[PDB]
Amino acid sequence: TQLQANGFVVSGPSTTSGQGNYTSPYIYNDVTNYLRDEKNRPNATFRDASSRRLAA
Amino acid sequence: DALSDGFVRLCIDPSLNFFGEGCKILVEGQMTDDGSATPDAVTCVTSELDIIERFGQGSVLTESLRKVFCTCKSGVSVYALPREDAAAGVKAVYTLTIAGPATTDGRVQLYMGEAEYAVDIGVDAGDTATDIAAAIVAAISPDFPYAATAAAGVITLTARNAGTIGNHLSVIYTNLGSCTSVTPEGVTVTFAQTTAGSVNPTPNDYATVVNECCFAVYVLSSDDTDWQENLRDWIRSAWDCSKPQCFGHGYVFNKGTLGQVLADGDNSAELSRLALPTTYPVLPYLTNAAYGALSACSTCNNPELNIQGQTFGLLSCINMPESCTPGWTFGEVTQLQANGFVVSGPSTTSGQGNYTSPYIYNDVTNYLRDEKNRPNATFRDASSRRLAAATGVALAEFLQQFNGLAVFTKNTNIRTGIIGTNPRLMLGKIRKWAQDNVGTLFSEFDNINEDIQLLTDFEVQPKCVGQPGIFHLNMRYRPPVRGARINVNMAPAL
Amino acid sequence: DALSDGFVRLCIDPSLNFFGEGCKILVEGQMTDDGSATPDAVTCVTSELDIIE
Amino acid sequence: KLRPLQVGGVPGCANIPGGEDCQCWPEWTADNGYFFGDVVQQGGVLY
């Protein structure tokens, strides 16, 4: 959660397979490292990485 | 054959013009001795077949005419003013070094000048430099403005026209890696240009070869500054006050770094200087002539639209190889836009896949500051120039009903029955003509009460000097406005 | 072709990958000395069979 | 390691080993009577 807050992408395993037991990581919160705005006023405009592609 | 009667007479003929000559253009360039046209004499050109024997095969004027015919398909009457090489001219010579026995398959493509002269050899696993050079020389198109001679690895390309117009050759491999069509291990072909300049002609005889033939567009196929200054003087003489005017415009180019191209410019409001970067792949006069022809085959019936934008200002006959470093950096681009220069860029910037056609921005002229010294943009873009010419001609044709008519200056009272007129009535009629043209030739006049003035010659001139039947007209129009920058400023919220 | 019969004449584009060329992805990283690529210059990679060399 | 070759390019990849037909040293055939010393070629070997 600390990482989710400061615009950091986190990856974790998909299945609960137990020790050993190959798995495959997936991504949560496909977000950019944008948490503050210009003139230091917090926002969420460019947090989602899709918001940026949609701006373009 | 049931046509015997004689009522209807067929004339089936595929070579028949219906729409007059139209939109006269003049292409000025150097030719070789192989041609059969008398130098220093304006002639008419009708097709792209007889140009080879008339202006010599490989002459710069030949390629200029070919590009003019490739662009402007139909609607222009092209003329050519062929001039011959100056006496003291070292025909430019370039050396191209190939190498590397061979190691694998693939295609070796070369790009010299414009894409029409591109060659493609099939060098496969195992070969030799000598044979590669022989294949290259055999694959070079004969219309290329350079004579090729092999030296078993030293391809020597000599310029068919002596002068400074030969110092603008470039060859790109456009295949090293190039994302597809892999190359057989050869060498990095080396381009060196051992030879040089040796000044080109300087005719200065426009006042004789063309006396009253009103031309619409003059294109120039030489990089000499004095020649372009002579052409400027001529066209300025066409826009005089002394004699009736054959209005015209001229299209020239200037190639070099930012310093020399800003130096090449002046307050020439009669020419459209086209700036070119130092690493321009295409031969300059080709794109210059293409721009000139386009601007003459698309505007002469519609003298309001600017040759500009992805749709209108597209030079389809010129093909450049793709590249990511686009010559003029944007700083240089805006610097050139400011100092009245036409700039050209690519139209696809597609990384490394294939050829792309260039494209012009800002179809403007080199008119920075007014005649006194003040800066103003009345003659900045070329459409304002063509529009001023058209408006002058239209007003001249409208005013013809007065020349020959009885005019009353004193006592102002046209007696009953006679067909006279007085200055107030002429002023009213001229005001209404100027007014009902708002929207096609003028703009939304602001203070028409003083934009149009009609003064009799008995008051313009001093006392006991006027001449009966002479009038002075002063008009201050304003060409219509169009679309330009939009400057979006989208700004999302939380 | 002259030997053909009808009139509709198809002209297949030289190569595939058309629907791409709009999604370029630049991968940046170090390389060993075995490679034959010129350093410090973007160059596309078509297939996977020729990244080792 | 497999490399796409070209149009016109096998002479390179391979070496196209040419054919050969040498039948000197007349072949042994039972239809003939031989003397002591007569040399023949049978199975590619001279006897």
Side-chain angles (χ1 to χ4, degrees), chain B residues 407 409 457-458 465-471:
Chain B
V407 64
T409 317
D457 210 15
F458 287 95
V465 185
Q467 311 304 319
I470 313 293
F471 293 106

mmCIF file of all heavy atoms in Angstrom, chain B residues 407 409 457-458 465-471:
data_model
loop_
_atom_site.group_PDB
_atom_site.id
_atom_site.type_symbol
_atom_site.label_atom_id
_atom_site.label_comp_id
_atom_site.label_asym_id
_atom_site.label_seq_id
_atom_site.Cartn_x
_atom_site.Cartn_y
_atom_site.Cartn_z
ATOM 1 N N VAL B 407 -17.525 64.235 -69.500
ATOM 2 C CA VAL B 407 -17.418 64.491 -68.071
ATOM 3 C C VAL B 407 -17.599 65.978 -67.813
ATOM 4 O O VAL B 407 -17.107 66.818 -68.573
ATOM 5 C CB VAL B 407 -16.072 63.992 -67.511
ATOM 6 C CG1 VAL B 407 -14.920 64.751 -68.129
ATOM 7 C CG2 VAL B 407 -16.053 64.125 -66.012
ATOM 8 N N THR B 409 -16.971 68.907 -64.970
ATOM 9 C CA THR B 409 -16.208 69.230 -63.775
ATOM 10 C C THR B 409 -16.723 70.503 -63.121
ATOM 11 O O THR B 409 -16.991 70.521 -61.917
ATOM 12 C CB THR B 409 -14.723 69.369 -64.117
ATOM 13 O OG1 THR B 409 -14.337 68.310 -64.997
ATOM 14 C CG2 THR B 409 -13.887 69.297 -62.859
ATOM 15 N N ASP B 457 -8.115 66.434 -61.928
ATOM 16 C CA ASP B 457 -6.742 66.880 -62.114
ATOM 17 C C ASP B 457 -6.598 68.382 -61.948
ATOM 18 O O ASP B 457 -5.472 68.872 -61.820
ATOM 19 C CB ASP B 457 -6.225 66.469 -63.484
ATOM 20 C CG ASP B 457 -4.740 66.222 -63.482
ATOM 21 O OD1 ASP B 457 -4.167 66.096 -62.386
ATOM 22 O OD2 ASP B 457 -4.138 66.158 -64.572
ATOM 23 N N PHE B 458 -7.702 69.125 -61.948
ATOM 24 C CA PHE B 458 -7.625 70.565 -61.765
ATOM 25 C C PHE B 458 -7.295 70.957 -60.336
ATOM 26 O O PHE B 458 -7.024 72.133 -60.086
ATOM 27 C CB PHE B 458 -8.941 71.215 -62.183
ATOM 28 C CG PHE B 458 -9.156 71.238 -63.663
ATOM 29 C CD1 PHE B 458 -9.886 70.245 -64.283
ATOM 30 C CD2 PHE B 458 -8.621 72.248 -64.436
ATOM 31 C CE1 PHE B 458 -10.082 70.260 -65.639
ATOM 32 C CE2 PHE B 458 -8.816 72.268 -65.795
ATOM 33 C CZ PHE B 458 -9.548 71.272 -66.398
ATOM 34 N N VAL B 465 -2.380 74.228 -64.270
ATOM 35 C CA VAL B 465 -1.590 73.078 -64.700
ATOM 36 C C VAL B 465 -2.446 71.892 -65.109
ATOM 37 O O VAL B 465 -2.003 71.072 -65.936
ATOM 38 C CB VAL B 465 -0.597 72.665 -63.587
ATOM 39 C CG1 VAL B 465 0.317 71.546 -64.054
ATOM 40 C CG2 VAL B 465 0.223 73.857 -63.131
ATOM 41 N N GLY B 466 -3.673 71.768 -64.608
ATOM 42 C CA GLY B 466 -4.471 70.588 -64.878
ATOM 43 C C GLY B 466 -4.816 70.433 -66.344
ATOM 44 O O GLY B 466 -4.706 71.357 -67.148
ATOM 45 N N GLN B 467 -5.243 69.221 -66.689
ATOM 46 C CA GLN B 467 -5.581 68.868 -68.061
ATOM 47 C C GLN B 467 -6.985 68.281 -68.067
ATOM 48 O O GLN B 467 -7.256 67.327 -67.313
ATOM 49 C CB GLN B 467 -4.569 67.878 -68.637
ATOM 50 C CG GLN B 467 -3.130 68.290 -68.417
ATOM 51 C CD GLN B 467 -2.835 69.664 -68.974
ATOM 52 O OE1 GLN B 467 -3.295 70.018 -70.059
ATOM 53 N NE2 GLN B 467 -2.075 70.454 -68.226
ATOM 54 N N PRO B 468 -7.900 68.812 -68.870
ATOM 55 C CA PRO B 468 -9.277 68.308 -68.867
ATOM 56 C C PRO B 468 -9.342 66.819 -69.165
ATOM 57 O O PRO B 468 -8.734 66.330 -70.117
ATOM 58 C CB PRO B 468 -9.953 69.128 -69.971
ATOM 59 C CG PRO B 468 -8.833 69.720 -70.764
ATOM 60 C CD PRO B 468 -7.726 69.932 -69.802
ATOM 61 N N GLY B 469 -10.093 66.097 -68.342
ATOM 62 C CA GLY B 469 -10.312 64.683 -68.552
ATOM 63 C C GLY B 469 -9.351 63.758 -67.845
ATOM 64 O O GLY B 469 -9.360 62.555 -68.129
ATOM 65 N N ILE B 470 -8.531 64.268 -66.932
ATOM 66 C CA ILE B 470 -7.585 63.464 -66.172
ATOM 67 C C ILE B 470 -8.097 63.370 -64.744
ATOM 68 O O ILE B 470 -8.511 64.379 -64.164
ATOM 69 C CB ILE B 470 -6.175 64.072 -66.205
ATOM 70 C CG1 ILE B 470 -5.792 64.460 -67.627
ATOM 71 C CG2 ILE B 470 -5.168 63.089 -65.660
ATOM 72 C CD1 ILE B 470 -5.627 63.288 -68.545
ATOM 73 N N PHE B 471 -8.083 62.162 -64.184
ATOM 74 C CA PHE B 471 -8.543 61.943 -62.822
ATOM 75 C C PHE B 471 -7.505 61.155 -62.040
ATOM 76 O O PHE B 471 -6.687 60.438 -62.617
ATOM 77 C CB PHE B 471 -9.877 61.201 -62.789
ATOM 78 C CG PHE B 471 -11.018 61.995 -63.339
ATOM 79 C CD1 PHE B 471 -11.551 61.699 -64.575
ATOM 80 C CD2 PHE B 471 -11.566 63.031 -62.614
ATOM 81 C CE1 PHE B 471 -12.599 62.428 -65.079
ATOM 82 C CE2 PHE B 471 -12.610 63.763 -63.117
ATOM 83 C CZ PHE B 471 -13.128 63.459 -64.348
#
